[PDB]
Amino acid sequence: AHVQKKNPLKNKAVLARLNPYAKAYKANVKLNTGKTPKAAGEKFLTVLHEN
């Protein structure tokens, strides 16, 4: 049993044998649908520049 070690990061069949959630895993979920404000702050900018 287990004569050879397969890399799950390269072998998708092993990546399915382990981690069954990998089938339903969803990446690159977009969440910038809003107005995208600019939370900079007057005090933060003055301190950031300063001298």
Partner RNA sequence: GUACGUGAAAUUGCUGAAAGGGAAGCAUUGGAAAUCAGUCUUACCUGGGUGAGAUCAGUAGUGCGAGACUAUGCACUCUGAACCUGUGGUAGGUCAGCAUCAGUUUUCGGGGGCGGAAAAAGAAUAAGGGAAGGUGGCUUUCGGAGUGUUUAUAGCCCUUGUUGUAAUACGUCCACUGGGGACUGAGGACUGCGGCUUCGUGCCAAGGAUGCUGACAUAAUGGUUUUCAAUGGCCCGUCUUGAAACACGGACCAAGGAGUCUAGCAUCUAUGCGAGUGUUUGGGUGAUGAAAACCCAUCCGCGAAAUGAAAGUGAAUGCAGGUGGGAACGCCCUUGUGGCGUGCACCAUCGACCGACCCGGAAUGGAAGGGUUUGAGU
Partner RNA sequence: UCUAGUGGGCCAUUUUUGGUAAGCAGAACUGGCGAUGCGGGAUGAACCGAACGUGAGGUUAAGGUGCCGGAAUGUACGCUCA
Partner RNA sequence: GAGAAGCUCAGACGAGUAGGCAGGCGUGGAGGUUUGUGACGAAGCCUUGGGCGUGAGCCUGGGUCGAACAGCCUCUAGUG
Partner RNA sequence: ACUAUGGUUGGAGACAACAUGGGAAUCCGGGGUGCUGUAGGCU
Q: What is the DSSP letter of 18?
A: S
DSSP for the chain, written as a single string: ---S---TTT-HHHHHHS-GGGGT---S-----S-------HHHHHHHH--
Q: Which of residues 31-50 bind another protein (CB under 8 A)?
A: 39-44, 47
Which does residue 51 bind out of another protein, RNA, none, counting CB within 5 to 8 angstroms by kind?
Answer: none
| Minimum CB distance to RNA, residue 7 (Å) | 3
The reply on whether position 23 binds RNA by CB under 7 A is yes
Tokens 């301190």 — which residue? Answer: 47
The reply on whether position 13 binds another protein by CB under 8 A is no
The reply on whether position 30 binds RNA by CB under 7 A is yes
